[PDB]
Amino acid sequence: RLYDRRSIFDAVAQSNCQELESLLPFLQRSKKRLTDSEFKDPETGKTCLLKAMLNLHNGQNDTIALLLDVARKTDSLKQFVNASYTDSYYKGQTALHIAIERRNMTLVTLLVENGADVQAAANGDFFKKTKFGELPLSLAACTNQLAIVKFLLQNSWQPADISARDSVGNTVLHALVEVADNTVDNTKFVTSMYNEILILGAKLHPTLKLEEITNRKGLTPLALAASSGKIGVLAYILQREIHE
């Protein structure tokens, strides 16, 4: 009949609802909400949904489901599902991001249909270059996740902005170029995903001049490849760029 940060986090990660059974009335009666400070790790920002996203057997976590649901019934749902990591390492990350990272269609769908921002920028160190993509779109795109990419743009609940730009003004095409490392297998996949995107550049916005967008440096996706030295892809872009 009561719950604290750990109590919930415990069951969520344990992946059981018998101990979550009755979370709503606590929140109802205590007028506390999963959203406010108490139920977050100030260090990171892990909300109980975010713990759930990390802990999942075979891709399953029935917690996620009777959790967005308990969040929805408590007047905090858009706020709850878009919660990102307050830290400097995993800065932008939302529930949605992880679902895409973890290549989970069933979870990425049961998430945006509960109102996940499909424009949330993965702002942290984790996504940056030190050894892109940044946007749920550009991410799925770059991870080779076409089945999800389509779901993002062609979405009935919330369309992904196909011509969006991250910090450093990079679109999905830029992102792809940025990922081309010249391997037989790499060039192939980037080429395909590139093509596929431009094809959806027909059905959804036959009006958009997508090939022509400039990043913060001021390069077209082609112009990037030219300097970036991704010769394989540059050849594709140019070759296709002649209607076949």
Ligand SMILES: Nc1ncnc2c1ncn2[C@@H]1O[C@H](COP(=O)(O)OP(=O)(O)OP(=O)(O)O)[C@@H](O)[C@H]1O
């Ligand atoms: N977006 C992410 N992708 C992959 N791994 C992550 C991500 N965010 C956090 N992690 C890693 O996974 C762990 C988070 O999962 P979880 O909270 O279940 O860990 P835990 O062992 O239960 O407890 P703790 O959070 O104290 O480690 C972190 O230890 C972190 O190193």
